[PDB]
Write a protein that binds this ligand. Sequence first.
Ligand SMILES: [Zn+2]
Length: 273
Amino acid sequence: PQLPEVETIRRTLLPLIVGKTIEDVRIFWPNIIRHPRDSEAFAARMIGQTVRGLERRGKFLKFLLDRDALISHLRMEGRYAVASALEPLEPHTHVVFCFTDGSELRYRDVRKFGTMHVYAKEEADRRPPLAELGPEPLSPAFSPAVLAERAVKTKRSVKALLLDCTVVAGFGNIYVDESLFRAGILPGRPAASLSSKEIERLHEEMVATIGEAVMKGGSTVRTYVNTQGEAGTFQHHLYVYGRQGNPCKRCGTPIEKTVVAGRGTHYCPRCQR
DNA sequence: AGACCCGGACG
DNA sequence: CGTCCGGGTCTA
Ligand SMILES: [Zn+2]
């Protein structure tokens, strides 16, 4: 899940939990719990708190409780659902928050990569994992100037640059490849090689792509669904991601796939330079 | 780049 | 049944 997927989950999850009070927290894979590292303290502190809000920062969900914020990262496969305490759990359910009304917030994660950190609200933004995060791409804090400043300082690939959460928040493998295609820039280009015009174009396409994907409920390419289990539709608007061997939608040249920055990387060798 | 982790898709 | 694949990304 990237920004659009996490944002769609945020919007669809909030009404199902807002105003509910935690009665128990049950943990079946303690490694997911990162702070307090003692899962017993993590569970104990949340009991009796009420969910007041749910925000997103980058790819993180921020559950606003009473004293605390719970910072949750889904990583590759994490997901939330709300269901009755009376029903058996689904496979791969690793954390459950039980509410006083008999419903439960269930966290499922087949690969177990997800993380949870709880801090006092006023502390969460200055501690890991939120502390190092770059600007929200849909905010004024993300500008061509901000992008140029990081690009000029490094010979790392432009793909690696956009995947760096400290540069800009919320971009992952799908939206980096898509933004680079739309901007006409090869993903293996050294970041420092980008012209002023290319930086401007890249910023414009990054903002447009993310916004469009939010509007379309995210990209369901393998396993992502919203809180109601509904697939996104942005996958129908992809130019390159997962389209290797298929014709480019713009020029008909077969899309190629390589490895860049240790990641599967999709591009059109004609449209991108 | 490796680790954390698992199951699907493909030969 | 084995091999490679994956919307993330921390540390090594
Ligand atoms: Zn093309």
